[PDB]
Amino acid sequence: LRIIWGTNVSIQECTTNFRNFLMSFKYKFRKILDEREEFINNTTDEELYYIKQLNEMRELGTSNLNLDARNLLAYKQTEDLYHQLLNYPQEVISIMDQTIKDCMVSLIVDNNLDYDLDEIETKFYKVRPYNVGSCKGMRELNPNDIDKLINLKGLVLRSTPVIPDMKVAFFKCNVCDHTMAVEIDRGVIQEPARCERIDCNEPNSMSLIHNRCSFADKQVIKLQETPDFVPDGQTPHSISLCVYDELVDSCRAGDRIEVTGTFRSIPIRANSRQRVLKSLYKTYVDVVHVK
Amino acid sequence: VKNSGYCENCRVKYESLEQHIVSEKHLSFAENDLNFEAIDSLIENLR
Amino acid sequence: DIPPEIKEEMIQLYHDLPGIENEYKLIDKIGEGTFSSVYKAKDITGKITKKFASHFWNYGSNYVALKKIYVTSSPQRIYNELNLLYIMTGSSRVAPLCDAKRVRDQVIAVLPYYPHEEFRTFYRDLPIKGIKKYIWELLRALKFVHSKGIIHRDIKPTNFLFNLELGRGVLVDFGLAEAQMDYKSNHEQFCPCIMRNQYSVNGVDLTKGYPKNETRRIKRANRAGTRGFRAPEVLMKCGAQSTKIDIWSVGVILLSLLGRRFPMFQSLDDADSLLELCTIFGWKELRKCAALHGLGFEASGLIWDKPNGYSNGLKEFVYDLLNKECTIGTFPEYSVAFETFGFLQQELHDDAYELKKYQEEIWSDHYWCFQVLEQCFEMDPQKRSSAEDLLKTPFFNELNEN
Amino acid sequence: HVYLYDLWQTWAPIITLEWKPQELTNLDELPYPILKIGSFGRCPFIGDRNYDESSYKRVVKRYSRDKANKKYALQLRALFQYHADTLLNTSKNLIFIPHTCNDSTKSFKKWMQEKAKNFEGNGLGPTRASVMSKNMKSLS
Numbered sequence: 001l002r003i004i005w006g007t008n009v010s011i012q013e014c015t016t017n018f019r020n021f022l023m024s025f026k027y028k029f030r031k032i033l034d035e036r037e038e039f040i041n042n043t044t045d046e047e048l049y050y051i052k053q054l055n056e057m058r059e060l061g062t063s064n065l066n067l068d069a070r071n072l073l074a075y076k077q078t079e080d081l082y083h084q085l086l087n088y089p090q091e092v093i094s095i096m097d098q099t100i101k102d103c104m105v106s107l108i109v110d111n112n113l114d115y116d117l118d119e120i121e122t123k124f125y126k127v128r129p130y131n132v133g134s135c136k137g138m139r140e141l142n143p144n145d146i147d148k149l150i151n152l153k154g155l156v157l158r159s160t161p162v163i164p165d166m167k168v169a170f171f172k173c174n175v176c177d178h179t180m181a182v183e184i185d186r187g188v189i190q191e192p193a194r195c196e197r198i199d200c201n202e203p204n205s206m207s208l209i210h211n212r213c214s215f216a217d218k219q220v221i222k223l224q225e226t227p228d229f230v231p232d233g234q235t236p237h238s239i240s241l242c243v244y245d246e247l248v249d250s251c252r253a254g255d256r257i258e259v260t261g262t263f264r265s266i267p268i269r270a271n272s273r274q275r276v277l278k279s280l281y282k283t284y285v286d287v288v289h290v291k
Numbered sequence: 292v293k294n295s296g297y298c299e300n301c302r303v304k305y306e307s308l309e310q311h312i313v314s315e316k317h318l319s320f321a322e323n324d325l326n327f328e329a330i331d332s333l334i335e336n337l338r
Numbered sequence: 339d340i341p342p343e344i345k346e347e348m349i350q351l352y353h354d355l356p357g358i359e360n361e362y363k364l365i366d367k368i369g370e371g372t373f374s375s376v377y378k379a380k381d382i383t384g385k386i387t388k389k390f391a392s393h394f395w396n397y398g399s400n401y402v403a404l405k406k407i408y409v410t411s412s413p414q415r416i417y418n419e420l421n422l423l424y425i426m427t428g429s430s431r432v433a434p435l436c437d438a439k440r441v442r443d444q445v446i447a448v449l450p451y452y453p454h455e456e457f458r459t460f461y462r463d464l465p466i467k468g469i470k471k472y473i474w475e476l477l478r479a480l481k482f483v484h485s486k487g488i489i490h491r492d493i494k495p496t497n498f499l500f501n502l503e504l505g506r507g508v509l510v511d512f513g514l515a516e517a518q519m520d521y522k523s524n525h526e527q528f529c530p531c532i533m534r535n536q537y538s539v540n541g542v543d544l545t546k547g548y549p550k551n552e553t554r555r556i557k558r559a560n561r562a563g564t565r566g567f568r569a570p571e572v573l574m575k576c577g578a579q580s581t582k583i584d585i586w587s588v589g590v591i592l593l594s595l596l597g598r599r600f601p602m603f604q605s606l607d608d609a610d611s612l613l614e615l616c617t618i619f620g621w622k623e624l625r626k627c628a629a630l631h632g633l634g635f636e637a638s639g640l641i642w643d644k645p646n647g648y649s650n651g652l653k654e655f656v657y658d659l660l661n662k663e664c665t666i667g668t669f670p671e672y673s674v675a676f677e678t679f680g681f682l683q684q685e686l687h688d689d690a691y692e693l694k695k696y697q698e699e700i701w702s703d704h705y706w707c708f709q710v711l712e713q714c715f716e717m718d719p720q721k722r723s724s725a726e727d728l729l730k731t732p733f734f735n736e737l738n739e740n
Numbered sequence: 741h742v743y744l745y746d747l748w749q750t751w752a753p754i755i756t757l758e759w760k761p762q763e764l765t766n767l768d769e770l771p772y773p774i775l776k777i778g779s780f781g782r783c784p785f786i787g788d789r790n791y792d793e794s795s796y797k798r799v800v801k802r803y804s805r806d807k808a809n810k811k812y813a814l815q816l817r818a819l820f821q822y823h824a825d826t827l828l829n830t831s832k833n834l835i836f837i838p839h840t841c842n843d844s845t846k847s848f849k850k851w852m853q854e855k856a857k858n859f860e861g862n863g864l865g866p867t868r869a870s871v872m873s874k875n876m877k878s879l880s
């Protein structure tokens with residue numbers, strides 16, 4: 001039971017379905033799906049595809065699994081998981097990362113391999129779904145497509161320098177030099193209004209130490225749409241993509257790339273002085289995969 | 292269809308025994324005699 | 339006479355195995371299990387009945403038990419069970435492997451049929467001497483298994499099959515039986531618990547609370563076994579496990595008979611079973627047990643009915659398990675539990691002279707029975723007695739007829 | 741609370757149970773096993789829940805079950821009375837140790853004292869990783 005509020009996603013069922021897909025998928029499934037059954041060769045299309053990929057990632061030390069979304073359509077149990085991933089990329093991708101970690105731990109333990117489990121457990125594994133449904137361009141997306149996994153295709157024009165995105169805020173006491181380390185939560189950091197030390201309770205003693213905080217890489221990339229379908233009378237469009245923490249500087253200007261990411265919308269403050277947002281939201285893409 | 296549980300052979304969880312044993316991976320595992328090798332020593336070691 | 343739904347199962351076993359139409363005629367299904375369904379069968383042609391005649395119990399006509407191992411079991415686990423059944427043959431208390439047959443994913447283990455009574459039927463009525471015969475046979479089987487040097491993790495009343503009228507039994511299940519490996523490839527190295535090779539401050543305590551988002555892997559130690567018979571060393575994740583734990587599983591059954599309660603421990607979780615062991619013994623005993631395997635125990639704010647409860651001993655425990663029983667009236671008039679109840683009314687203070695010296699017989703028997711019961715129920719793995727020493731204890735002074 | 745950890749702090753804590761005070765109410769069901777005794781072979785931790793062994797409706801069951809279960813226990817008694825080894829069974833017939841605690845038979849005779857015409861799944865599981873990500877915990 002216990003599905004997530006606002007989504008069809010259930011953690012237990014989605015985890016079970018994705019694990020079954022990972023343990024029991026062969027590329028002959030997709031070859032059957034694409035009506036290409038006469039290209040099916042028994043040698044490489046009959047091996048578990050993602051088991052081999054997991055083994056290669058374990059041997060190479062990498063952390064990112066490139067999941068072809070259309071593969072989920074080939075498997076029967078994940079026919080719904082495809083729609084769940086497209087509709088709710090955040091929850092489903094988090095569950096997929098957890099499932100990848102469980103799958104690799106199971107591969108090491110169940111087969112009784114020599115590989116150390118300490119560095120596997122402490123490693124953060126990520127999933128990169130790319131081949132999601134390619135249609136609707138970028139301008140045909142409605143507000144109902146916000147926070148959905150979309151696929152754009154275009155040309156890289158420009159890329160801003162590496163922007164530091166604070167993940168942990170490091171405060172320091174102006175009196176007793178005691179420091180707490182606040183964690184960011186949905187883009188908001190709770191600044192302490194009192195030193196947590198029981199010895200001194202000075203109200204505004206705490207000051208943020210900018211250079212001792214924890215930062216992560218963020219980059220904004222200017223992309224020109226080259227959609228498969230172009231409605232009459234429109235001119236080429238430019239969008240802003242956001243790459244995070246490993247995809248920074250992976251795209252250079254002039255590159256023709258197919259990018260899969262979350263279609264997001266953010267309210268833009270009208271002025272830098274007051275806190276007032278504009279009722280017309282600004283749309284962008286959180287990049288999760290670049291091809 | 293109350294039979295549900297894990298399968299150490301296929302490493303997949305099933306909701307139904309009569310559909311897991313007829314699934315692709317389980318049939319492929321069963322047809323492969325290399326998996327059932329150490330037991331093959333015993334069948335004729337006793338006989 | 340056979341219920342209809344089992345006919346499909348047996349015709350499935352006929353169909354799934356093309357070559358079993360002869361050489362085996364299935365009569366019934368003796369017993370089912372989580373990992374297998376065992377089937378009562380007659381032997382069409384007499385290899386394993388004409389052979390293995392020493393192993394068969396000559397109680398009525400002799401039949402054969404074929405263990406149809408469930409399909410979901412891994413090939414290595416099936417091989418493990420079959421191989422360990424193979425290495426230990428020639429013993430009358432092991433139910434050794436007469437035959438085996440593999441077709442595709444189905445494996446049948448053909449072992450001698452041993453007529454047995456389920457524990458839950460005769461546990462309440464067993465006299466103290468019958469409990470003694472039970473424990474003697476169990477300890478003989480465990481002694482052979484431990485001499486062979488493997489841990490039969492799942493020791494439980496169901497996995498020990500005992501015929502009362504012949505009065506002996508056999509240990510049958512081994513699917514979960516782990517094999518011990520050497521201590522080195524006097525409590526300095528066997529149990530600081532160093533195994534997994536992971537044995538090789540300021541501002542943080544890690545004793546008053548646990549981290550909110552933990553970045554450490556939990557210990558991975560074997561937990562195979564059965565609810566309510568897991569030893570303390572297997573309840574707190576401990577590598578370097580030894581045969582000693584099976585000895586603990588001997589006591590619980592010995593505790594089941596004395597008290598007339600079969601489900602001794604509910605054991606819903608490992609923590610739940612560990613807290614169940616806190617109620618009979620005490621928080622301090624469990625913490626001092628944990629301090630041996632390198633682990634720390636901590637519990638507070640809990641309304642335990644007796645702090646350090648049942649300290650007089652497990653004697654007082656069975657006496658309360660019998661008190662509620664002897665006040666409400668749950669025992670029959672032809673009960674055997676009243677002897678134990680009147681003997682604990684001795685141990686706790688709270689012609690016809692076969693009456694008097696059978697009185698002395700059953701009282702000496704009970705007095706030594708609780709001694710073996712507490713040797714089995716010990717927190718320390720090393721200072722716990724082994725099968726040999728447990729069998730040499732003076733409670734079992736009926737081995738002279740050998 | 742109950743908290744079992746590794747003093748070396750090398751492994752993750754095995755037991756971390758933390759119950760709020762309102763969860764400690766309703767002593768009929770605790771989140772932890774407080775010792776209970778029970779009767780008729782009950783698991784000590786399990787109580788007589790929705791079971792009143794003092795109810796005659798129950799009593800006419802247990803004594804009567806004991807009447808049909810009488811001589812199986814008599815056979816077993818006579819077979820395991822004198823010698824632990826059963827190879828010397830064949831040989832006044834039955835001896836008993838006297839008692840004074842009331843019984844199922846004594847209870848039923850009491851209920852005729854008091855009521856009758858007078859006043860008063862599969863077994864295996866997948867191998868899951870131990871470390872839970874922050875996002876997965878937030879989704880809970």
Ligand SMILES: Nc1ncnc2c1ncn2[C@@H]1O[C@H](COP(=O)(O)OP(=O)(O)OP(O)(O)=S)[C@@H](O)[C@H]1O
Nearest residue numbers: 369370371372373374376403450451452510511513
């Ligand atoms: N030789 C035998 N003769 C008679 N019954 C047997 C024999 N071997 C096993 N059984 C029965 O088999 C049933 C359970 O199968 P087991 O051999 O214990 O293996 P299992 O299926 O792994 O059981 P669990 O799950 O560990 S209790 C019990 O009820 C036993 O009585």
Ligand SMILES: [Mg+2]
Nearest residue numbers: 511512513514
């Ligand atoms: Mg078993």
Ligand SMILES: [Zn+2]
Nearest residue numbers: 173176195200
């Ligand atoms: Zn301060």
Ligand SMILES: [Zn+2]
Nearest residue numbers: 298300301317
């Ligand atoms: Zn399978």
Ligand SMILES: [Zn+2]
Nearest residue numbers: 529531576631
């Ligand atoms: Zn230990």
